[PDB]
Paper text:
The OBV M segment encodes two glycoproteins, Gn and Gc, derived from a single polyprotein precursor, with Gn encoded upstream of Gc. Compared with other bunyaviruses, OBV Gn is relatively small, with an ectodomain of about 200 amino acids (aa), whereas Gc, with an ectodomain of ca. 900 aa long, is about twice the size of its Gc counterparts from other bunyaviruses. Our structural analysis has revealed that this region is composed of two domains: a 27 -kDa α-helical head domain and a stalk that is divided into two identically folded 19 -kDa tandem β-sandwiches. Furthermore, the head domain is well exposed to the environment and is a major target of the humoral adaptive immune system of the OBV mammalian hosts, indicating that the trigonal pyramid of the spike shields the functionally more critical membrane fusion core machinery from the host’s antibody response.
We crystallized the N-terminal half of SBV Gc (aa 465–874 in the glycoprotein precursor) produced in recombinant Drosophila S2 cells. The best crystals diffracted anisotropically to 2.5–2.0 Å resolution, which allowed the X-ray structure determination and refinement to a final Rfree value of 0.24. The structure showed two rigid domains separated by a hinge, adopting a V-shaped conformation in the crystal. The N-terminal head domain (aa 465–702) constitutes the first arm of the V. It is an α-helical bundle with approximate dimensions of 6.5 × 4.0 × 3.5 nm in size with a molecular mass of 27 kDa. It is internally stabilized by four disulfide bonds and carries two N-linked carbohydrate chains at positions N493 and N686, protruding from the same face of the ellipsoidal head domain. Of note, the glycan chain attached to N493, which was earlier shown to be essential for protein folding and secretion, is well ordered through stabilization by the local protein environment and not by crystal packing. The rod-shaped second domain, which we term stalk (see below), has dimensions of 7.0 × 3.0 × 2.5 nm and extends from the vertex of the V-shaped molecule. The stalk can be further divided into two subdomains (aa 703–798/ 799–874). Despite having low aa sequence identity (18%) with each other, the two stalk subdomains share a common fold with a root-mean-square deviation (RMSD) of 3.2 Å over 64 Cα atoms, indicating that they derive from gene duplication. Each stalk subdomain has a molecular mass of ~19 kDa and comprises two antiparallel β sheets packing against each other. Moreover, each stalk subdomain is internally stabilized by three conserved disulfide bonds, with the corresponding cysteine residues conserved between them and across OBVs.
Author numbering: 467 to 874
Write the structure that this text describes.
Amino acid sequence: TSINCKNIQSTQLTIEHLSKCMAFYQNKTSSPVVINEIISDASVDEQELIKSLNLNCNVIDRFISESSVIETQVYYEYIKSQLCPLQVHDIFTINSASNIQWKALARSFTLGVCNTNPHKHICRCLESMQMCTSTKTDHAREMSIYYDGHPDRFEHDMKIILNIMRYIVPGLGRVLLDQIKQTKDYQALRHIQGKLSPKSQSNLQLKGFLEFVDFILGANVTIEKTPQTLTTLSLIKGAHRNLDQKDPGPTPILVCKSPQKVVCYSPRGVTHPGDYISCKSKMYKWPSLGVYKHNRDQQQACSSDTHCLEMFEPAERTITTKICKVSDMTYSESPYSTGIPSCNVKRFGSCNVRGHQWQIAECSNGLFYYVSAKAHSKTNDITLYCLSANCLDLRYAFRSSSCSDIVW
Ligand SMILES: *[C@@H]1O[C@H](CO)[C@@H](O)[C@H](O)[C@H]1NC(C)=O
Ligand SMILES: *[C@@H]1O[C@H](CO)[C@@H](O)[C@H](O)[C@H]1NC(C)=O
Ligand SMILES: [Cl-]
Ligand SMILES: [Cl-]
Ligand SMILES: [Cl-]
Ligand SMILES: [Cl-]
């Protein structure tokens, strides 16, 4: 059957049916549509809700991962299918740019089945992108011996495979993959890979990988599944913590004092709940780059990173008309949330933040850090620098966008 990803029903909130709403499954490979045209079918309030987000092809996956309600995530995934066809389908072109990530992971995270007999064609496919044409047919009996009746190993390799596929289907596909990982419902992966394979026939490497995913999904093993507990519009409607005061902040702010998570949905018509943050009981838009703990005061919330350099945008004016449930605060677990005392420095530079110069370093991970005036390298590595004076205190990355006039 077919479903409407713009207005997904309660019965259709399963991995089997949610997989039909992955952007690539829309079979739209060209002609991007402007955002104002994509959203003209929906309600006026939903239209203001989306226009307020300033969606583009660079931020829509972050809005998808950052959203809390599954209907909203599906909706933004459809918007991505309409807004970024080339980006959505670039992975299926052989050796394309979008292929760099999954292959990379495939070389770094060796499967457990590749510990012995590394000349198997699946191992050479993930390691050197060779023999990808015979991944399932080569040594299928030995790999069956390795997998059948061995749930431990099977789960190891399945986790590796899911992590690999998180870079093949970004957005909704990643949500479904993490859901599979949490529920251990490994057979449900057939609803994803089963839709990827007929579109990967030209990408011979991806084709071989997906064929092996099929093979391992056929393993004679038994694992009991964990309940799904996926957040739906129904969970939001049937919940407490109602807010009578839904007033938006007058002006944008940097520091969110007394933060609370908020999820707001319109009372009538088809709606997709929007995410907001309350700061001193004033409504602000939840940023696509995540909410972080202020490094200067960890009971305060910042947008995009821990330095409170990015402005919180006040909520739309119609927020008072919508219903709002307070939700538990969720902070970002991205690398910008965790501080480090030292790093291997690629280069030192100077950057103009808030109108003043600051010595910065780009570490090997690509992140930018303020560099202590007492920074120094460690004994056995000329690139390994203490970012703090005592080489113990943690220092947090900041987005390069808060810089201007970077000088290397
Ligand atoms: C896209 O093509 C697949 C076949 O590969 C089909 O199952 C699906 O329904 C199509 N999506 C549409 C028509 O929206
Ligand atoms: C799977 O393995 C078991 C042994 O654990 C075996 O008895 C059975 O025949 C195999 N095939 C199945 C269950 O289809
Ligand atoms: Cl087309
Ligand atoms: Cl993510
Ligand atoms: Cl810092
Ligand atoms: Cl950045």
